[PDB]
Design an enzyme around this catalytic site. Structure first.
Site, PDB file in Angstrom:
ATOM      1  CG  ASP A  87      -1.512  54.254  26.920  1.00  0.00           C
ATOM      2  OD1 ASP A  87      -2.772  54.282  26.281  1.00  0.00           O
ATOM      3  OD2 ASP A  87      -0.404  54.848  26.616  1.00  0.00           O
TER       4      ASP A  87
ATOM      5  CB  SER B 285       2.522  56.008  21.426  1.00  0.00           C
ATOM      6  OG  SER B 285       3.440  56.880  21.942  1.00  0.00           O
ATOM      7  N   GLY B 286       1.925  52.570  21.184  1.00  0.00           N
ATOM      8  CA  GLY B 286       1.252  51.699  20.890  1.00  0.00           C
ATOM      9  C   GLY B 286       1.875  50.392  20.376  1.00  0.00           C
TER      10      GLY B 286
ATOM     11  CG  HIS C 102      -1.350  57.570  24.340  1.00  0.00           C
ATOM     12  ND1 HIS C 102      -0.534  56.427  24.649  1.00  0.00           N
ATOM     13  CD2 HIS C 102      -0.692  58.145  23.323  1.00  0.00           C
ATOM     14  CE1 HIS C 102       0.593  56.539  23.988  1.00  0.00           C
ATOM     15  NE2 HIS C 102       0.447  57.483  23.091  1.00  0.00           N
TER      16      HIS C 102
END
Ligand SMILES: O=C1c2c(c(C(F)(F)F)nn2-c2cccc(-c3n[nH]c(=O)[nH]3)c2)CCN1c1ccc(-c2ccccc2CN2CC[C@@H](O)C2)cc1
Lengths: 234, 52
Positions: A88, A185-186, A42
């Site tokens: 994801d 995120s990530g 994402h």
């Protein structure tokens, strides 16, 4: 990261930072090898063209240990969709190899069965990133980390307003208000075993940040080890 | 107990084969002579902090 502590010199060497055209970080990643970065699918929608920075702990100044790498290939899981946030995960191959040094080193990829039986059954893991330090706020200029308890899968599902798939897991606190946040995120969720750190999760999503009765949601790396292995050859 | 007893005394990966413990290591490590410890093949092996 809301709460937690700064990553001190050498403590989080596998952290990567995805940076956009403005040279600002918008997501994290985990170094897997000299050519490969693990991150969230994402995140790939957050910037048209981006690069990867390694070795940074303070975005305010250059220390001489930082290095920027261009991305040669983006490998996004073909089943990711923003409708479910399932799958994801993405892998990036870099144009040039990362130089390992103080503050720059890969995290270990575990084996599936052992990771699920031995790593994910431990009390806690560690999440890190340059994300927001309060639910409302700007990205952190300092790399932070936070110890987060693994959460029972049942308690995980009951806490969530959204479907937690088998590709996801929960970590965090029920009452103590510290957790990951937007911008983390990530990035890495790692689990320590005998002073060796294995990557176990990818920061994926959460309902707000550090909210009581809520947790951080991570992509379960063990669910994708074969997909990761294939991507690191293609 | 095998693998369930203190990870079979393995540094890293533990498997049970023929009712016995077999240890193994992540890439960049080699299994030591004692069949339990994992030895780095170079500087900056995966999963190690850089504190020294
Ligand atoms: O991920 C965030 C988010 C937000 C903010 C901020 F609050 F900053 F805005 N931070 N942040 C974030 C980021 C990374 C880590 C943590 C974190 N870790 N630990 C902790 O506590 N929080 C927090 C905003 C909301 N969100 C979000 C994204 C996606 C879904 C989701 C889930 C399942 C199916 C589909 C969808 C997506 N759809 C689209 C419409 C929506 O209704 C459902 C839900 C929430």
């Amino acid at each position: 990261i809301v709460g937690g502590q700064e990553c001190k010199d050498g403590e989080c060497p596998w952290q990567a930072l995805l940076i956009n055209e403005e040279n600002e970080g918008f997501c994290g990643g985990t170094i897997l090898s000299e050519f490969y970065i693990l991150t969230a699918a994402h995140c790939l929608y957050q910037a048209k063209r981006f690069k990867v920075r390694v070795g940074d702990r303070n975005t305010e100044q250059e220390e001489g240990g930082e290095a920027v790498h261009e991305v040669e290939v983006v490998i996004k899981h073909n089943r990711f969709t923003k409708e479910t946030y399932d799958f994801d995960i993405a892998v990036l191959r870099l144009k040039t190899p990362i130089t390992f040094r103080m503050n720059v080193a890969p995290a270990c990829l575990p084996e599936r069965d052992w990771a699920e039986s031995t790593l994910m059954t431990q009390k806690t893991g560690i999440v890190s990133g340059f994300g927001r330090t309060h639910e409302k706020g700007r990205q952190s200029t300092r790399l932070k980390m936070l110890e987060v308890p693994y959460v029972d899968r049942n308690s995980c599902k009951l806490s969530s307003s959204f479907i937690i798939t088998q590709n996801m897991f929960c970590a965090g606190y029920d009452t103590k208000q510290e957790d990951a946040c937007q911008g983390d995120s990530g990035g890495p969720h790692v689990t320590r075993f005998k002073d060796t750190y294995f990557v176990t999760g990818i920061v994926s999503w959460g309902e707000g940040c550090a909210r009581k009765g809520k947790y951080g949601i991570y992509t379960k790396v063990t669910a994708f080890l074969k997909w990761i292995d294939r991507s690191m050859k293609t | 107990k095998l693998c369930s007893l203190d990870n079979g005394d393995c540094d890293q990966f533990c498997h049970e084969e023929q009712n016995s413990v077999v240890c193994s290591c992540a890439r960049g490590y080699t299994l030591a002579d004692n069949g339990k410890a994992c030895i780095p093949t170079g500087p900056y092996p995966c999963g190690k902090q850089t504190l020294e």
